[PDB]
Design a protein around this ligand. Structure first.
Ligand SMILES: [Mn+2]
Ligand SMILES: [Mn+2]
Ligand SMILES: [Mn+2]
Lengths: 304, 302, 304
């Protein structure tokens, strides 16, 4: 029972949740970080609608945590652009307190989705353990949010700029299911495969939804990662994308890029080295994840 | 929680409702134990041992998708017979085995989880998982440690195997605020061995003192479990110098990933002649006795 | 919670009942800080600083097995006389010291726990524990960081104790979603020094802003504490090079003697003090923190 001053859920989204319609949450750190970003966010939403679900994009607008955004608010974040704060769990109180706009990471989008009672969240890729984290301790707060918050996150696996092995160990220690959708191999984000394997392979949205129900009815708190391979036709060739990522990582280290700036810097550089191709792949994987997320949301509402 | 998800056997139900002391047991001892029909028989004997101590045993497992607190003879027999075909169930595995109606053997973490759902505060096992050697670069860290950080259950064990990294494990437990109690020992015992190069966080000499501390801990709202490291009886114990000699040797030989830990297990086994299974059975009986005592005293004090 | 476990002094009960701002203080600085009578004198002087700021101090300790929130002069003197005979009490120690009827000095972590049990939201200390130098191979990481992750108390400090690894500590706090607020500073102060190569998560210039963010954070269900890093007053600051030399020596030698455990911080601060031969600065940063904490408590109580 949080104050309407802090949190506001759109009329459509309230309506949908009351009527037990499937809702899929979306993050805003994709929209920030124009007027392309806006149009694209709006058609991720329309993709969800065409899959028979209701999209809810989450962001902080004028200090208010908002679940479901008008096209005007979407626009606002789009044009305000890089001036928008990237908001993780530790940033969230300050942006709200100060009455500012903010774009939510995987972690804070999970937080707000859970406040609104939304169990399914579609994104591109989750944060994770950064390469070199054995000596830097640079580990995304996303992984702790997954440890603790009851939301299924549908992604292309963790972002492949990270250390995927360490990320899978970390997920295991903290008891977070890593589900391959129709895959045993952990998808590489831009790529379909990787040297690492998910914790369980499941072939149907129905199985995932049933597992969500069981997990939470049994009081095992925390989220689920659903790793969904990018469609083959949009995947990056392993060698090319690997070279680009490796060079970007090396440059980030050499340039002292650290903290919240690491991921956006890496993604932007990789786009540069691949001539925008990695970006096209990123878009395709996000649509793909929105579709799957919609199916899981439908089956979850059916099973609960 | 739904009876379709979780079922407590009539015996354990009666014990709980009447406030009789209950001790949880894991099921991986049955599936991964001696060849049937011995693994079954043994699990049965551990239960009987708990009853003779004046406690009610609850063996925990997943049978046909149901989390089961306490088992019948035929469930135990079924797990024994299915043997290694039964999957070991961790926290991240639990929902899926249950959803899919599978059988499964519960690990330390999953047994703590299910016990806690049943309101059982004491769990007797052989050993706990820990931080693995090389975890500083592999991040391979047992989920048991996080379960201990979060779930209110006292796990009576022989500590963790010396094949793990015990220094890192003791640090990890301190960071997460988990008591490591030596039972009548300052030295941290490890599996085969009554001692090791590391210390517990506190030594306590009685079941009643451990119970008293559990009561203060949870009445003060400090959630999370407790490790009670109980040295293997001298009769079954192995000298620390030989065990350490063997491990150092096996780790020197391994030097020249996922194969590291069990490689060390097998090698140390070969070198010392130590037998993991037999030793573990001994550990479970011993810990089952201590655990029954702690459960009785806790029941008294709460 | 039973009166047998936890007792709140009349002064503090009065304050809580009448909605007066309360600031918690630790006991470990008392027992393990310096020699008697000076240690007890200083403790009482810190309490008086708080009172002068118009807040009410609550020094916390375990006395005769009881968790005490607010202490008598007699009790502070007891802890001061006993000095190092008094056990340093962490979260994993607390149940056993209470059960055994023992006296004990509470760490940052245990002080947070007991303060929270009493509804006290603001705690002034010298510096927080953190990730130790070499923690990448030793895993020596203060339980203070986990307490900050989980317990709802704002801790006003001069940053982390500076014998620690500040880089690893800042990454750790970020992973676990803990705000690190610089009070009128973006650079993270390092204990004796006003600045360091590292940054806080957000700079805030007023106690009012800090309080408003506390209310928003906890009303939004984001449990966990907040670190407020308050640079030592310029007149008491120590030159980076000199202090860094001493600290360097003390650490290298702590590794030489091989002290690893809870005795590490006491040993370190000891040796460094010796080479300093630092204590003046430590006392003054504590007073400074007590003053800021009093203001934060006033602003927070005003809202709560
Ligand atoms: Mn990071
Ligand atoms: Mn492992
Ligand atoms: Mn330590």
């Amino acid at each position: 029972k949080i104050s309407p001053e802090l949190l506001q859920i759109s009329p459509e989204v309230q309506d949908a949740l009351k009527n037990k319609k499937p809702v899929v949450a979306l993050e805003s750190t994709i929209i920030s970080h124009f007027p392309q970003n806006a149009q694209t966010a709006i058609e991720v939403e329309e993709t969800i609608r065409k899959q028979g679900a209701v999209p809810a994009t989450i962001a902080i607008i004028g200090g208010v945590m908002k679940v479901g955004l008008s096209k005007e608010e979407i626009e606002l974040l789009g044009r305000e652009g890089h001036n928008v704060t990237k908001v993780s769990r530790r940033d969230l109180p300050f942006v709200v307190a100060a009455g500012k706009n903010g774009a939510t990471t995987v972690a804070s989008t999970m937080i707000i989705a859970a406040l609104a009672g939304i169990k399914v969240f579609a994104t591109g890729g989750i944060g994770g353990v950064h390469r070199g984290a054995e000596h830097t301790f640079d580990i995304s707060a996303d992984l702790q949010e997954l440890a603790n918050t009851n939301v299924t996150v549908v992604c292309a696996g963790a972002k492949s700029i990270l250390d995927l092995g360490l990320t899978t160990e970390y997920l295991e220690t903290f008891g977070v299911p890593l589900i391959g959708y129709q895959t045993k191999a952990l998808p590489a984000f831009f790529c379909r495969t990787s040297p690492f394997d998910v914790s369980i392979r499941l072939d149907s949205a129905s199985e995932i939804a049933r597992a969500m129900v069981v997990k939470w009815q049994s009081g095992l708190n925390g989220g689920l990662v659903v790793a969904n391979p990018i469609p083959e036709q949009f995947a990056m060739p392993e060698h090319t994308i690997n070279a680009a990522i490796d060079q970007a990582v090396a440059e980030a280290e050499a340039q002292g890029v650290i903290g919240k700036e690491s991921t956006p810097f890496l993604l932007a550089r990789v786009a540069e080295l691949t001539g925008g191709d990695s970006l096209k792949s990123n878009i395709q994987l996000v649509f793909n994840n929105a579709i799957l997320a919609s199916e899981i949301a439908k089956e979850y509402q059916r099973l609960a």
